[PDB]
Design an enzyme around this catalytic site. Structure first.
Site, short mmCIF file in Angstrom:
data_model
loop_
_atom_site.label_atom_id
_atom_site.label_comp_id
_atom_site.label_asym_id
_atom_site.label_seq_id
_atom_site.Cartn_x
_atom_site.Cartn_y
_atom_site.Cartn_z
N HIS A 49 0.86 -1.19 0.00
CA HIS A 49 0.00 0.00 0.00
C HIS A 49 0.89 1.23 0.00
O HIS A 49 1.56 1.46 1.02
CB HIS A 49 -0.92 0.07 1.26
CG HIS A 49 -1.65 -1.23 1.48
ND1 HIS A 49 -1.15 -2.29 2.11
CD2 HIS A 49 -2.88 -1.57 0.99
CE1 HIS A 49 -2.03 -3.27 2.00
NE2 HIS A 49 -3.06 -2.82 1.33
N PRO A 97 -5.81 -5.37 11.23
CA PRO A 97 -7.23 -5.27 11.52
C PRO A 97 -7.61 -3.90 12.03
O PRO A 97 -6.99 -3.36 12.98
CB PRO A 97 -7.43 -6.38 12.51
CG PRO A 97 -6.38 -7.40 12.17
CD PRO A 97 -5.24 -6.45 12.03
N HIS A 141 -4.40 3.23 -3.22
CA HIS A 141 -4.47 2.70 -1.86
C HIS A 141 -3.71 1.41 -1.58
O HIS A 141 -3.26 1.22 -0.45
CB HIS A 141 -5.93 2.50 -1.46
CG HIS A 141 -6.20 1.76 -0.14
ND1 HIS A 141 -6.34 2.24 1.08
CD2 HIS A 141 -6.33 0.39 -0.02
CE1 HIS A 141 -6.56 1.25 1.89
NE2 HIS A 141 -6.55 0.12 1.23
N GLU A 181 -16.98 -5.07 25.64
CA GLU A 181 -16.14 -6.26 25.50
C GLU A 181 -14.98 -6.14 24.49
O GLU A 181 -13.83 -6.23 24.94
CB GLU A 181 -16.98 -7.47 25.07
CG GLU A 181 -18.03 -7.95 26.08
CD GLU A 181 -19.34 -7.14 26.28
OE1 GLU A 181 -19.84 -6.66 25.26
OE2 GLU A 181 -19.86 -7.05 27.43
N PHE A 196 -20.00 -13.74 25.53
CA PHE A 196 -19.77 -12.44 24.92
C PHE A 196 -18.28 -12.16 24.75
O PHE A 196 -17.90 -11.11 24.27
CB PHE A 196 -20.55 -11.40 25.79
CG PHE A 196 -22.05 -11.68 25.81
CD1 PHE A 196 -22.80 -11.71 24.63
CD2 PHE A 196 -22.70 -11.96 27.01
CE1 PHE A 196 -24.17 -12.02 24.67
CE2 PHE A 196 -24.08 -12.27 27.04
CZ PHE A 196 -24.82 -12.31 25.86
N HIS A 247 -27.50 -16.48 25.94
CA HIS A 247 -26.47 -16.33 26.95
C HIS A 247 -25.74 -17.64 27.25
O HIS A 247 -24.75 -17.61 27.97
CB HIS A 247 -27.11 -15.80 28.22
CG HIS A 247 -27.67 -14.38 28.08
ND1 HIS A 247 -28.60 -13.90 27.23
CD2 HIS A 247 -27.17 -13.31 28.82
CE1 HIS A 247 -28.66 -12.61 27.42
NE2 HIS A 247 -27.80 -12.26 28.37
C1 LIG Z 1 -11.07 -5.41 10.35
C2 LIG Z 1 -10.61 -5.13 8.98
C3 LIG Z 1 -9.27 -4.90 8.70
C4 LIG Z 1 -8.90 -4.85 7.34
N1 LIG Z 1 -7.64 -4.62 7.11
C5 LIG Z 1 -9.86 -4.70 6.33
C6 LIG Z 1 -9.49 -4.25 4.94
N2 LIG Z 1 -9.14 -2.76 4.88
C7 LIG Z 1 -7.90 -2.27 4.98
S1 LIG Z 1 -7.83 -0.59 4.74
C8 LIG Z 1 -9.52 -0.58 4.47
C9 LIG Z 1 -10.21 0.65 3.93
C10 LIG Z 1 -9.48 1.95 3.85
O1 LIG Z 1 -9.29 2.44 5.19
P1 LIG Z 1 -8.36 3.70 5.40
O2 LIG Z 1 -7.84 3.70 6.80
O3 LIG Z 1 -9.07 4.98 5.00
O4 LIG Z 1 -7.10 3.64 4.38
P2 LIG Z 1 -6.58 4.61 3.22
O5 LIG Z 1 -5.18 4.27 2.99
O6 LIG Z 1 -6.90 5.92 3.84
O7 LIG Z 1 -7.47 4.36 2.07
C11 LIG Z 1 -10.05 -1.86 4.53
C12 LIG Z 1 -11.42 -2.30 4.11
C13 LIG Z 1 -11.14 -4.83 6.69
N3 LIG Z 1 -11.51 -5.05 7.99
C1 LIG Z 2 -23.13 -8.23 24.67
C2 LIG Z 2 -23.70 -8.26 26.02
C3 LIG Z 2 -25.06 -8.50 26.18
C4 LIG Z 2 -25.50 -8.64 27.51
N1 LIG Z 2 -26.75 -8.91 27.67
C5 LIG Z 2 -24.65 -8.33 28.60
C6 LIG Z 2 -25.17 -8.29 30.02
N2 LIG Z 2 -26.09 -7.09 30.33
C7 LIG Z 2 -27.43 -7.05 30.14
S1 LIG Z 2 -28.09 -5.56 30.53
C8 LIG Z 2 -26.50 -4.98 30.92
C9 LIG Z 2 -26.21 -3.56 31.30
C10 LIG Z 2 -27.33 -2.75 31.82
O1 LIG Z 2 -27.98 -2.56 30.58
P1 LIG Z 2 -29.03 -1.46 30.35
O2 LIG Z 2 -29.30 -1.48 28.89
O3 LIG Z 2 -28.55 -0.14 30.92
O4 LIG Z 2 -30.35 -1.82 31.18
P2 LIG Z 2 -31.15 -1.23 32.43
O5 LIG Z 2 -32.47 -1.86 32.41
O6 LIG Z 2 -31.06 0.23 32.12
O7 LIG Z 2 -30.27 -1.64 33.52
C11 LIG Z 2 -25.60 -5.98 30.87
C12 LIG Z 2 -24.12 -5.88 31.19
C13 LIG Z 2 -23.33 -8.48 28.36
N3 LIG Z 2 -22.86 -8.45 27.07
#
Ligand SMILES: Cc1cc(N)c(C[n+]2csc(CCOP(=O)(O)OP(=O)([O-])O)c2C)cn1
Ligand SMILES: Cc1cc(N)c(C[n+]2csc(CCOP(=O)(O)OP(=O)([O-])O)c2C)cn1
Ligand SMILES: [Ca+2]
Ligand SMILES: [Ca+2]
EC number: 2.2.1.1
Lengths: 678, 678
Positions: free
Chosen positions: B28, B115, B261, B416, B443, B479
């Site tokens: 690149h 990534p 790019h 996470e 998770f 879960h």
């Molecule tokens: C998680 C993840 C990592 C990866 N390397 C890719 C591919 N990738 C690399 S650069 C990019 C897109 C361009 O991003 P940029 O930071 O704007 O780079 P630039 O040189 O400015 O075009 C993608 C899709 C996808 N998804």
């Molecule tokens: C990806 C993810 C999904 C999950 N359900 C959780 C657990 N969980 C459920 S509700 C919550 C946090 C409190 O969530 P909220 O949207 O603020 O709900 P409320 O009723 O306001 O307490 C957590 C950590 C962990 N990780």
């Protein structure tokens, strides 16, 4: 104007959601209690028919914070869906229709939610599928499509990056029928949001292009809650987030503490609550007749008139616009076109070596016009995935000048998890939508919270995952899959097809699209593979088959994708030294497993050694092969031929391992890895 | 003050990175050509020692856009790191020190990137680890820690959910020394950004609490870049983003195009710009002495001097604060306190049945005092994961009133994937930092991006993953993990511990903490589980050991976690009907495979049927067993004991299956699954 009954209905919603957590003696009571006024207000102006949960033009509601499910089951029950007091009385119990988190599969439940940030991204997908249906079928006189998408969410959804991914794309796309209400309750499990989350959601949302309306007294302002949604219905150019403040566990003695979040309330606390709202404290699961009556009159009887009038217009529409009506009634009946399959490409071994990624582009190129429900996209890798057919229009706002919403190709951004859940929501809208999303096989791993739910809910979405192995070469190990197929093969219900040649890509697409309940990942080569002598669509469709057979094989070599040709070459070497190899091509573990054991056992029988060949993790392979030649360490930067040869995946190198397998087992009788004892 | 040798230095950086791409004929060019002005200005004023990459108080730099490696490799070569022109001439070639994406392992390379959204989120972990260490050891007259953490990032990392997650947390935590510089080049892979990315980034990061600065001419304005980095360092309470606009491929004949790019510039395009930049068209990998000379005075000799002064201040620190000096010196040698393991708990079959989750909590109470560098957290699950010790203090800003920067307990929010990457950042910093964080096992799959890089790089981070199965119960399927361990056992270099009890948890924490190169996941139970007579830290440290033995077994039962107990009960039952079962505990497949084969084969001998017991997917168990009793469908909502009972995981359910295994195989000779042909 809301009246006394609106207030009795909100009390009934609050206490029925509390009697259900308490009897299960398990669950989350606090967000039901505080969100109950907006659930009453919102639901009462949704146009939906409780007798027909499948009506395509129903307004659609997502509970992105699905832990709050006791409120959903309360609403579902109260406005006339098939869910009873008895169902409610077996919440969270083994076998009920009332799980501890909403599952797509129940009437009135749109998607499966409970992982956070998954609901909001699912609802963006839905808003995209509506916008497209409208631009494709709505004719003057015939507005068949115009519904809203309503999303309820919390702080937890707003901390998950997928929501961000999703909200950026939604603001870009100007999706004005998506109206999100957020439970600004200031609590999450550990305590006050301030202890970690103290940013400016509203200013962050306005940077995406959403409109932010605020409801400061979500606990009692029915008229403000109502006014916000009214006003929101006017921002057609920008989606709306309505920041609504509420006290978690409102009405409880310990309301506003994180303690009301996820445990049942104390008996004493539930009794006072009931008295407080004028309910008898010693009586559970009590629904005032004026409440049943209210909803019958304001929601179910209107909705059944709404679905009636919509049908009359659609029968007219089909007289007026025959082609379009037949196509749409087919999408609604969930059928793929009759003999659509005939347009799929077949090849012979005179045809040339092509990477299965180019071959992909050609199925797309040869079936998009067959299938108007096919909408595709890439997460910023369109040129590497080759996901655009040439005559495509981009799914965009008309304001963009790059496309419009009749377009069927979406540019997802470098947003993989969001693509996972938007396709799960586009799939979920109905009208037989067939979404496919492209990315590189290693970064499908970025989208695993979404990909898992495709399997669980059963959303039949397609990920075209190119650049499947060390064939990638110079980009090296951050971009070369090892453990990937092995992971998705351990997840119940998803096809993981790794086609070897043109006819094996057409069987991967045939099975992927005919699927109604099982997602699919198609893992595709960057590099050129030849056309195998022996592959048809028909045999590749059975998931695994004998590509070359010999009478009385010394060994059966089982291989997938780029390694099947290597095995055909290794078999060519072995013959020269008089070892008879049968070559089994195994393109999808899932489809194969679905074959009858008579068939599977004919493919991989007793008494022959089986050695598998695939340039990725060997772990998953003990259920078919006796020995496995694979890669269980990370990859390497290098020209890809040099990388395969490094790892030993050359014809003679494979052959040698087959010879060592023969020698190792010589004079042992062998039982197929397929035979199970219980 | 920037002069003409700053101008010679930016053209050498540019054309050197160009020659590297173009000779690899892969790579690149775009971003190295546009970010080269900013690489020059920033490195010129960073405090670092090329000859010692391990100086703890070095200013750190992460290229989040790892795809622009060639810029980084040019800078490391020119400023005097161990990297040369011949190393560069071998870019992207199998076996070189110059891979297509940066990798932790090279000196000068801080973490592996490629990534998107990973390098920036690591920088936040690194900035926290600066904050913490400075708050621990700095005394008046001894500022031993005061460095900045600089990041370079593109539009694609600004499109990934993880960086939103991390920026939200970095704003809350007020990490004023973390300076990020966004390459606002308007391109990505598919084309322009308006096509998908069009949000107000500046208004979004301000919403987080970040300071946003702007450089409008990032292609030529060296002084403007310089002034933003300066203003930025003054932001002591706000982290800063400098939105610096460049032209992708600047200098090229296709500057601003998206074909610049990630492909080599065409041969004649390379000649026109060498000529434009006053270099000779027909010569390559050419560094003018004056650039070498420049960086010698500007960077190497000052940093050496500064490092040397750091060492004298530190020797006087050790005189003055002898015990605190002693400690930081241990951490900086990377030694763990002599005989720390003595504080690890031991239990006997006498002691109560405790959930492995509570036993975990206990190891945290006994060790945090021993281990000053143990910094832990939760992604909003502290009361569920039980991950905080009672005498703890949160990692938070001074102003919060709820903790301070010497705190060692992070409140991550529901983030996470950010927590796994921020953890890699903390670890990658040095000073023997030992990070952990908990969530629900299900998770951790949301963090799968960060977790693969923990394995690829070898960052020994620890995941505390409670709620390891259907033993969760009523939250049900969304879960309960099915696939999770199978997947992570398919990934090279990560230990996936699943302790059965007290002694097995202590074996897991000592191996996990003693680790210098492998990360860990400890899968812990919600439910109570019995102490086993036979478990011992010594045995469980071997990864798999015989827990119950018999002279001449009819069958061997291999279980993990909560099913080892179940398998002992199954063994009592089998003994009654006169079958002799040896029960084997296998807490980590990894640590077990690290054993001498000779040992492993004593645990799992030839000619006995081996059957594995675990309430998760069977697909990984083919490598140790002949038959497998496990769960390959998703789970269910019900009282946990009802869900186990439902799937057949009962003492007598396991035993019947063990009997059918015996019966199936009786008479055949059996080879242990450990044995390979080649
Ligand atoms: C998680 C993840 C990592 C990866 N390397 C890719 C591919 N990738 C690399 S650069 C990019 C897109 C361009 O991003 P940029 O930071 O704007 O780079 P630039 O040189 O400015 O075009 C993608 C899709 C996808 N998804
Ligand atoms: C990806 C993810 C999904 C999950 N359900 C959780 C657990 N969980 C459920 S509700 C919550 C946090 C409190 O969530 P909220 O949207 O603020 O709900 P409320 O009723 O306001 O307490 C957590 C950590 C962990 N990780
Ligand atoms: Ca909340
Ligand atoms: Ca860019």
């Amino acid at each position: 104007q809301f009246t006394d009954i609106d207030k009795l209905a909100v009390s009934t919603i609050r206490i029925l959601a509390v009697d259900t957590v308490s009897k299960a003696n398990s669950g989350h009571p606090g967000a039901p209690l505080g969100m109950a006024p907006a659930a009453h207000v919102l639901w009462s102006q949704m146009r939906m028919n409780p007798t027909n949960p499948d009506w395509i033009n129903r307004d659609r509601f997502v509970l992105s914070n699905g832990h709050a499910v006791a409120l959903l089951y309360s609403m579902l029950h109260l406005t006339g869906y098939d869910l009873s007091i008895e169902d409610l009385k077996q919440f969270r119990q083994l076998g009920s229709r009332t799980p501890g988190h909403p599952e797509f599969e129940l009437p009135g439940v749109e998607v499966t939610t409970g992982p956070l940030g998954q609901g909001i991204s699912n609802a963006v997908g839905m808003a995209m599928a509506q916008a497209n249906l409208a631009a494709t079928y709505n004719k003057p006189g015939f507005t068949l499509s115009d519904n809203y998408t309503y999303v309820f969410l919390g702080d937890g959804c707003l901390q998950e990056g997928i929501s961000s991914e999703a909200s950026s794309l939604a603001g870009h796309l100007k999706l004005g029928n998506l109206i999100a209400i957020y439970d600004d309750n200031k609590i999450t499990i550990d305590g006050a949001t301030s202890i970690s989350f103290d940013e400016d959601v509203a200013k962050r949302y306005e940077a995406y292009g959403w409109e932010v309306l605020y409801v400061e007294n979500g606990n009692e302002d029915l008229a403000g809650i109502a006014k916000a949604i009214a006003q929101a219905k006017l921002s057609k150019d920008k989606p709306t987030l309505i920041k609504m403040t509420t006290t978690i566990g409102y009405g409880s003695l310990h309301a506003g503490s994180h303690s009301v979040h996820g445990a049942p309330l104390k008996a004493d606390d539930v009794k006072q609550l009931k008295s407080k709202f004028g309910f008898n404290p010693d009586k559970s699961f009590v629904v005032p007749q004026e409440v049943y009556d209210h909803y019958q009159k304001t929601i179910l009887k209107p909705g059944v008139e709404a679905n009636n009038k919509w049908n009359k217009l659609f029968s007219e529409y089909q007289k007026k616009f025959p082609e379009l009506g037949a196509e749409l009634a087919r999408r609604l009946s969930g059928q793929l076109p009759a003999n659509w399959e005939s347009k799929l490409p077949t090849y012979t071994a005179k045809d040339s070596a092509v990477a299965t990624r180019k071959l992909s582009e050609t199925v797309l190129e040869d079936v998009y016009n067959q299938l108007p429900e096919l909408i595709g996209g890439s997460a910023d890798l369109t040129p590497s995935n080759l996901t655009r057919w040439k005559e495509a229009l981009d799914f965009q706002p008309p304001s963009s000048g790059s496309g419009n919403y009749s377009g069927r190709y979406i540019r997802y951004g470098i947003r993989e998890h969001a693509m996972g859940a938007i396709m799960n929501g586009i799939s979920a809208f109905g009208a037989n939508y067939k979404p496919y999303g492209g990315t590189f096989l290693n970064f499908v791993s970025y989208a695993a919270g979404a990909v898992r739910l495709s399997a669980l809910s059963g959303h039949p979405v397609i990920w075209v995952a190119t650049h499947d192995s060390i064939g990638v070469g110079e980009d090296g190990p951050t971009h070369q899959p090892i453990e990937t197929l092995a992971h998705f093969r351990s997840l119940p219900n998803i096809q993981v097809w790794r086609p070897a040649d043109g006819n094996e890509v057409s069987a991967a697409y045939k099975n992927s699209l005919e699927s109604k309940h099982t997602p699919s990942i198609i893992a595709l080569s960057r590099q050129n593979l030849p056309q195998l002598e022996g592959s048809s669509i028909e045999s590749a469709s059975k998931g695994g088959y004998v590509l070359q057979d010999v009478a009385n094989p010394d060994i059966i070599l089982v291989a997938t994708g780029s390694e099947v040709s290597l095995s055909v070459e290794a078999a060519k070497t072995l013959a020269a030294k008089n070892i008879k190899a049968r070559v089994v091509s195994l393109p999808d573990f899932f489809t194969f497993d679905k074959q009858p054991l008579e068939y599977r056992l004919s493919v991989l029988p007793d008494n022959v050694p089986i050695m598998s060949v695939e340039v990725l993790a060997t772990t998953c392979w003990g259920k078919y092969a006796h020995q496995s030649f694979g890669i269980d360490r990370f990859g390497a930067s290098g020209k890809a031929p040099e990388v395969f040869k490094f790892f030993g995946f050359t014809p003679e190198g494979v052959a040698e391992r087959a010879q060592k397998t023969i020698a190792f087992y010589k004079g042992d009788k062998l039982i197929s890895p397929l035979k199970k004892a219980f």
